[PDB]
Amino acid sequence: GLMQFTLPVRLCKEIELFHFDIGPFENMWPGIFVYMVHRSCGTSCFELEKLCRFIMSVKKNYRRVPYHNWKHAVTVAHCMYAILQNNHTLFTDLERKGLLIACLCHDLDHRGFSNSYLQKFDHPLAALYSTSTMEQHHFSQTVSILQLEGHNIFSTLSSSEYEQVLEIIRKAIIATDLALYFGNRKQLEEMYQTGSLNLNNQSHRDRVIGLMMTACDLCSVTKLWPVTKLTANDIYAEFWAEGDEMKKLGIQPIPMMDRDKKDEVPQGQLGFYNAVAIPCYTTLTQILPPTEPLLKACRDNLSQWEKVIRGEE
Ligand SMILES: Cn1ncc(C(=O)N2CCC2)c1C(=O)Nc1cc2nc(-c3ccccc3)cn2cc1C#N
Numbered sequence: 295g296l297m298q299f300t301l302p303v304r305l306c307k308e309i310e311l312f313h314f315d316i317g318p319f320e321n322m323w324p325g326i327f328v329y330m331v332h333r334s335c336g337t338s339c340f341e342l343e344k345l346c347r348f349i350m351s352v353k354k355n356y357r358r359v360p361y362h363n364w365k366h367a368v369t370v371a372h373c374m375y376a377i378l379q380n381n382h383t384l385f386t387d388l389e390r391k392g393l394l395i396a397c398l399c400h401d402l403d404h405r406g407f408s409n410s411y412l413q414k415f416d417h418p419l420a421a422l423y424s425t426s427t428m429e430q431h432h433f434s435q436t437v438s439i440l441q442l443e444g445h446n447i448f449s450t451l452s453s454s455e456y457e458q459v460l461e462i463i464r465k466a467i468i469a470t471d472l473a474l475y476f477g478n479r480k481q482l483e484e485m486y487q488t489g490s491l492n493l494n495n496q497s498h499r500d501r502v503i504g505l506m507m508t509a510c511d512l513c514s515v516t517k518l519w520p521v522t523k524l525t526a527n528d529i530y531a532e533f534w535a536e537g538d539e540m541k542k543l544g545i546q547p548i549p550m551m552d553r554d555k556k557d558e559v560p561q562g563q564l565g566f567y568n569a570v571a572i573p574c575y576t577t578l579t580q581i582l583p584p585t586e587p588l589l590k591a592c593r594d595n596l597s598q599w600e601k602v603i604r605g606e607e
Pocket residue numbers: 472511512514515526529549550551555556558559560561562563565566570
């Protein structure tokens with residue numbers, strides 16, 4: 295109970311900032327997550343023994359893939375930590391509990407392949423889950439781990455609170471299906487601009503949490519340029535492997551996944567910042583003004599990709 299996690303001075307200070315990188319020391323990531331749960335939620339939110347056992351089982355069920363790995367999970371959780379900490383009063387006790395867990399679990403058992411590839415492969419998961427295939431799997435893996443003996447971190451919650459938090463987690467994980475992001479943001483934009491956005495409306499809260507999940511999931515574009523650039527390498531390492539596997543099925547992959555078209559990556563990133571990232575952080579900043587640093591960092595990285603195209607690097 296009187297056992298706080300404490301980080302070294304540089305991490306203690308920089309972990310509060312949106313652009314924090316969790317670093318290359320894998321063994322410190324569990325402790326970083328617990329630290330964030332303690333400050334974001336409270337030292338009482340979870341039994342430390344159950345939480346630690348949950349974290350280590352989640353880690354074990356992330357795979358050794360270039361991008362959709364345990365580091366991504368903790369990175370996405372930290373961005374949620376920064377949003378929650380800069381929006382103290384806007385979120386319920388159950389939301390703060392569920393959302394850091396949702397982020398840690400949101401890509402559980404990812405193989406480094408898109409929903410499209412599972413469907414074209416005719417993977418069993420595509421028969422079990424026709425839409426948001428991997429995201430329904432991620433939620434299923436989250437429930438599986440929560441039901442392991444000594445892993446039920448929500449055991450103190452009432453039966454109705456337990457159902458509410460698992461519903462927050464399910465919606466939050468489904469929302470990380472980028473196919474659903476476009477429509478979600480359009481609705482939020484209209485609601486904000488016609489002034490009809492109401493944070494007491496549960497359907498509205500659900501939409502806002504969805505956008506937070508997209509924002510956290512894409513947060514590689516909100517880091518300092520060297521982090522953004524080196525993360526982009528891991529992303530394309532997966533995309534190009536999927537492209538190779540598409541070619542093995544006798545299907546020409548989209549250019550994004552074709553390693554023969556490495557040259558077009560800079561222009562591909564511009565499209566991504568303009569069509570997905572900038573719109574995402576703009577709408578998020580309109581709804582949650584203290585998240586503006588994410589939009590500012592995103593714009594800085596768009597400018598860096600423009601410089602790459604002009605051969606200034
Ligand atoms: C940074 N970031 N973080 C997440 C994602 C992402 O999607 N994720 C995570 C799993 C799903 C990205 C990303 O980079 N996304 C895209 C890159 C891209 N390159 C080209 C491209 C076209 C032509 C030629 C070469 C590349 C097209 N593109 C479309 C994209 C989208 N959407």
